[PDB]
């Protein structure tokens, strides 16, 4: 599934349409492809506290690394640095706002994201 359709299907609300349009049509005039690949637990250390967008990403990297989960976000063979910079960008901050925290964390933990011949994130086996 294409990234736009993932975000369209996982909106927390019918009332974020103005952001979805701004992100995809205005702000993103190669595509990202999304597949579910695990059903790991979304940990409450990440969901419960009131982290900013940047902090959450940082806390996500640590949690994946502390558990030795082989998610391309951190064991990737290519340059996380540029990917986590992307994940911290205003564009992925909107993605977070649109789908909510728990779903954003699901996206990073349990889905793969492919751009061209590279997986930006995901645990493959």
Are 114 and 43 within 8 A, CB to CB?
no
What sign for the dihedral angle of Cα 98, 101, 106, 111? positive
The domain containing residue 83 runs over which residues? Answer: 1-125
Beta strand 118-121 with 33-36 is unpaired
Please state, in angstroms and rounded to a whole number, the distance separating the CA atoms of residues 11 and 6.
9
Give the Å distances, CA to CA, from 91 to 22, 86, 118, 122, 125. 10, 8, 20, 19, 29
Task: List the determination method.
Answer: X-ray
Please state, in angstroms and rounded to a whole number, the distance separating the CA atoms of residues 116 and 33.
9
Nearest to 34 by CA among 115, 113, 118, 121: 113
Q: Where do we find the tokens 């969901």?
A: 47
What sign for the dihedral angle of Cα 123, 118, 27, 17? negative
Please state, in angstroms and rounded to a whole number, the distance separating the CA atoms of residues 14 and 5.
14
Please state, in angstroms and rounded to a whole number, the distance separating the CA atoms of residues 50 and 13.
20
Contacts of 78 (CB under 8 A, 6+ apart): 118
- State the resolution, in angstroms: 2.4
Domain count, the chain: 1
């Amino acid at each position: 599934m294409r990234f736009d359709q993932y975000v369209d299907e996982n909106k927390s609300s019918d009332d974020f349409e103005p952001l979805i349009h701004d992100l995809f049509e205005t702000r993103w005039h190669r595509e990202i492809w999304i597949e579910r690949v695990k059903d790991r637990k979304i940990p409450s250390t990440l969901v419960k506290p009131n982290y900013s967008h940047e902090e959450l990403i940082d806390m996500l990297i640590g949690y994946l690394a502390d558990n030795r989960y082989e998610n391309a976000l951190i064991n990737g063979l290519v340059t996380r640095n540029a990917v986590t910079n992307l994940l911290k960008s205003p564009e992925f901050r909107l993605v977070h706002t649109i789908i909510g925290t728990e779903t954003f964390l699901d996206l990073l933990i349990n889905y793969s994201a492919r751009m061209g011949n590279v997986y930006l994130w995901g645990e493959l086996n």
